[PDB]
């Protein structure tokens, strides 16, 4: 029902080592929370779900879907791809 993940960011060396999300949470709600750490506007984020073996499960999770749709598990990595322009 809840997962422990880490957060990485495509435009920085910044890592957040432990984060707990509900699998029922929409990806949009997760991006909101992610903003508290990296401060990319959520409209300019894609979330890539990587498993604990480094394998990409989803390159860009849809805002209206829930994290559990993507079969997220403990120790997985949500990588934030930063698309914000100039």
Numbering used by the authors: 2 to 87
Could you share sentences copied from the article?
Five tubulin-binding cofactors (TBCs) are implicated in late-stage tubulin folding and heterodimer assembly 1,5–10. TBC-B and TBC-E are implicated in binding α-tubulin, whereas TBC-A and TBC-D interact with β-tubulin.
The N-terminal Ubl domain of TbTBC-B crystallized in the tetragonal space group P41212 with a single polypeptide in the asymmetric unit. This is an example of a β-grasp fold, a common structure involved in protein–protein interactions 5–11. A pronounced hydrophobic core is present, formed mainly by aliphatic side chains. These core residues are, in general, conserved among the TBC-B family of proteins. A striking similarity is observed in the spatial location of two functionally important lysines in ubiquitin, and strongly supports a biological function for the Ubl domain, and by implication for TBC-B. Through reversible post-translational modification, TBC-B can influence aspects of tubulin biology in a proteasome-dependent manner.
